[PDB]
């Protein structure tokens, strides 16, 4: 994605996840954006308040402790 | 699908929080020799790193409470 300009409706699990991009508003694009990395070479832009993002960017994290 | 463009190695080089703008885990037990965190950037050049080391630990750590609170 160069911008985000919407969002994906579609909860995706933390086990198909490996890594996300963050998108701020003024840096290059007008919104804000969690852009999801899955695991299947694809990715989703996802909106930044959902409950279910900061829940997969919280177990990320927590993964990279055990690192 | 094709296999994971593995890291093989760490850079040497500290960079900016700043510049750093998401990542991307890679783990041993996923079938590369060694775990690595690959860092984004805006110009979409990403970079191998040490998961173990202070700089990248610091990067990942903000990242994740910079979204908690967005």
């Given at each position: 994605?160069?911008?985000?300009?919407?969002?994906?409706?579609?909860?995706?699990?933390?086990?198909?996840?490996?890594?996300?991009?963050?998108?701020?508003?003024?840096?290059?694009?007008?919104?804000?954006?969690?852009?999801?990395?899955?695991?299947?070479?694809?990715?989703?832009?996802?909106?930044?308040?959902?409950?279910?993002?900061?829940?997969?960017?919280?177990?990320?994290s927590?993964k990279v402790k055990?690192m």
């Amino acid at each position: 994605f160069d911008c985000c300009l919407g969002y994906t409706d579609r909860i995706l699990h933390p086990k198909f996840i490996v890594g996300f991009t963050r998108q701020l508003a003024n840096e290059g694009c007008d919104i804000n954006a969690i852009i999801f990395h899955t695991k299947k070479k694809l990715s989703v832009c996802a909106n930044p308040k959902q409950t279910w993002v900061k829940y997969i960017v919280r177990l990320l994290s927590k993964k990279v402790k055990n690192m």
